[PDB]
Amino acid sequence: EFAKEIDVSFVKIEEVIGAGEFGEVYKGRLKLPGKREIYVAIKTLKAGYSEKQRRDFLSEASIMGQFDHRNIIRLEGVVTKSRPVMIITEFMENGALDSFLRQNDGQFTVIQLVGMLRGIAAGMKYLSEMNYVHRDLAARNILVNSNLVCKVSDFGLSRYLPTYTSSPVRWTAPEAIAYRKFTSASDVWSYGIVMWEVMSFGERPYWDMSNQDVINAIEQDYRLPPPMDCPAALHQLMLDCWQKDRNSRPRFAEIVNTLDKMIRNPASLKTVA
Numbered sequence: 020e021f022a023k024e025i026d027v028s029f030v031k032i033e034e035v036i037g038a039g040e041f042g043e044v045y046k047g048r049l050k051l052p053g054k055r056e057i058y059v060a061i062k063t064l065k066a067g068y069s070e071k072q073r074r075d076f077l078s079e080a081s082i083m084g085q086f087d088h089r090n091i092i093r094l095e096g097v098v099t100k101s102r103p104v105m106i107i108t109e110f111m112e113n114g115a116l117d118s119f120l121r122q123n124d125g126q127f128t129v130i131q132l133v134g135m136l137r138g139i140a141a142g143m144k145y146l147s148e149m150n151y152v153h154r155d156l157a158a159r160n161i162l163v164n165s166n167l168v169c170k171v172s173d174f175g176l177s178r179y180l181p182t183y184t185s186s187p188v189r190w191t192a193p194e195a196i197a198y199r200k201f202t203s204a205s206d207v208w209s210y211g212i213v214m215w216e217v218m219s220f221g222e223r224p225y226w227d228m229s230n231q232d233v234i235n236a237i238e239q240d241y242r243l244p245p246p247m248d249c250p251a252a253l254h255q256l257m258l259d260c261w262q263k264d265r266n267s268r269p270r271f272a273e274i275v276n277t278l279d280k281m282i283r284n285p286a287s288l289k290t291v292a
């Protein structure tokens with residue numbers, strides 16, 4: 020049973036706004052009894068789905084429904100007791116962060132980009148302190164609203180932990196590639212990659228290098244260079260997230276504190292590499 024179960028009559032499905040693993044993402048309208056109608060995004064599961072597909076689809080809604088944070092995509096409702104099965108979230112006008120930035124190259128100031136990163140780190144602090152590992156933290160899995168508020172999304176690979184031993188290569192920590200051992204520290208590595216994506220206006224990490232080239236480079240202690248005009252302190256935070264020893268990486272609480280100090284100390288963001 021889902022606390023956020025909604026009657027199907029409450030949702031009105033409009034245009035397709037994206038694609039998902041199990042089906043399309045649509046823009047829609049949600050009308051809860053005695054409440055003003057809101058715009059929503061709707062994840063659907065294509066007709067003729069297998070029982071495994073349904074279970075996997077809904078496991079995302081189960082993880083999501085456990086979260087209530089500004090920087091974690093809000094679950095507005097789920098449809099499981101009726102057809103079609105749906106996951107209904109708050110509408111994010113600007114979609115995925117990586118493509119939003121590529122389509123808006125040089126549109127935002129360093130402080131605006133830092134504000135976006137602070138929100139992601141706050142969402143990840145909450146997620147990790149709820150004892151979860153995301154395992155798929157990438158700018159493409161971050162959604163952006165009209166006011167540049169960034170929210171962690173795509174909880175399919177998320178796991179309750181403190182290590183998750185498995186049975187997204189250029190975003191994955193080297194120990195997680197080598198041993199299939201995922202922790203909050205391996206999510207911190209992914210976060211460092213997201214920082215690089217944001218300060219690069221959505222450039223692909225490691226550019227045209229193959230997954231194999233990335234694995235080899237990381238093993239040879241290569242680290243991505245600072246993006247154009249990136250403050251030294253922000254690239255240093257990226258390098259801290261990318262320490263070989265996972266225990267040496269900052270925790271998400273520290274990352275938030277660091278970004279909060281930069282936002283308040285303009286001199287800290289006033290020196291390039």
Ligand SMILES: O=C(CCl)Nc1ccc2c(Nc3cc(O)ccc3Cl)ncnc2c1
Pocket residue numbers: 036037044059060061062092106107108109110111112113114115162172173174
């Ligand atoms: O408006 C645009 C133009 Cl790119 N795109 C989108 C695409 C997907 C969206 C989205 N997806 C989503 C993600 C999940 O992890 C679970 C459920 C859903 Cl519905 N949620 C909110 N807003 C969106 C906006």
